[PDB]
Design a protein around this ligand. Sequence first.
Ligand SMILES: OC[C@@H](O)[C@@H](O)CO
Lengths: 214, 63, 54, 223, 13
Amino acid sequence: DIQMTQSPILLSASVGDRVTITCRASQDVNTAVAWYQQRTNGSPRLLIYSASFLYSGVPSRFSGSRSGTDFTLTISSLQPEDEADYYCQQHYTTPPTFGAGTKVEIKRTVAAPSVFIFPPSDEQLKSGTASVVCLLNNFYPREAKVQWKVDNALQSGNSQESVTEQDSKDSTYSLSSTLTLSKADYEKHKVYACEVTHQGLSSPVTKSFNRGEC
Amino acid sequence: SEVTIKVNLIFADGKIQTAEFKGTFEEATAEAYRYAALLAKVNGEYTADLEDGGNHMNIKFAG
Amino acid sequence: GSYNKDQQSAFYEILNMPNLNEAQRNGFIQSLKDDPSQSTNVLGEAKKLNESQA
Amino acid sequence: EVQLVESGGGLVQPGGSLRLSCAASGFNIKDTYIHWVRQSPGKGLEWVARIYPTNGYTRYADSVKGRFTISADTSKNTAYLQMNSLRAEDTAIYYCSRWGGDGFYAMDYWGQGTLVTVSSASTKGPSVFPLAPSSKSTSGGTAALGCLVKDYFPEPVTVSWNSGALTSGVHTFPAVLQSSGLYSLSSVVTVPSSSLGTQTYICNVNHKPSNTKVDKKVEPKSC
Amino acid sequence: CQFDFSTXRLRCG
Ligand SMILES: OC[C@@H](O)[C@@H](O)CO
């Protein structure tokens, strides 16, 4: 079989930048290499075929080249909507094979998150589990630390985070952290607090509620 | 094991991109230098400064 | 459609396998119908599954 | 307009069988190759099989040979993938694509894909709880509210707001696998503070594997 | 980086 080795695995650049991603075949594949884009929630979309030819409807800022077994995909002027994963594929021999992909991210200015907190719903509290949600909205860069405290006791092992991919409009991230307790535990304590550390904040932000407050 | 080499790509006009290479230390290293050489064709001669035992690179292009 | 004697033989083997459930049996029979070129391969995988469920 | 539409994916037990369909329109599958390609966390994009419907020639990936078969019904312009003796490693999004279409030697149209989940775990519908807007979810004159879609299996669930009319300011978070083996996710939306109480906000949640359809109205709490 | 069904995106560590 033939393998396709993509590098780098991750590339971050500003809007308007020229970016280059590469793909090496383990043996001769002539020009039989295609490039696909995969945007969030999407299926792979053809950009380039036969190493250097632009598929219909694809912006002219995309281009491809070949040198021996090395293949390049270049985006001459990176746009926010180019934020996506890119995959090469050879079809010279069966099986056709794909590279592992390159993730392309957009660099932008630092933005602090809007931080919010949600007690468990009364509906949920009818049935023995309590989920407390901390929300960090529209921030950049992705790195953030979210810590939970219950009656000022640092929580560990009972929360999970989820982060969106970069926003289409503003290239930001949002994150949820969900603290899961039994209802019995939830009703036994008073103060529920989310502490957020992020580069855009001058010091960590704590968002808190007392159980039972309006 | 599996390591991540983090690279700053510093172009002559001041623009900066960042990239990551993953694999064994030796594979990731080889790929980073290879990528630098390729970018050098268009962006001018490169210089690579290594920090963190070679797990981070600052790669500057001459223009 | 019709089948040659080798094709018929593969159907018969899968039909008779005692450790397949009916979903599996008919799935494999469907594969024999789908792609005659794969008859030997399909029969081989049915045998492996039948054996593992002994 | 060329289109490929996959159907038939879902939860199946290890050792089990499933059949996928790929309905083509806007072109004739007799004029092209049709491929199945799958995508998984474990192996990324992986070619599965191909067929040339005008002569029936087929090829398969080594890892599925004997277990999967590809076929096509030109009279229905549809291709199929029979999947037997399924294993955990077969868990993936399955796409069909065409190749050689309009003389283009690449896979130039791919379907939306269909998820196959190979697992012995049982189907479970989610509970949908409001994330009510409050004094603790507002700043700068805007407010956040949402829905928590908790404890479902298998994927997928879909979430929209106001039957799809509300899309601005929406963040639907990636699903998270809980220690229980069930999935959970939240969807939130940021709206003007002044709209709370006058504009109806409903999250439309659908979990087809369990036939769960929930439309949850989210409003400020009583106190 | 690892593909995630939920987003259909690579997630890097
Ligand atoms: O494809 C739908 C998917 O985004 C949800 O199931 C959440 O993962």
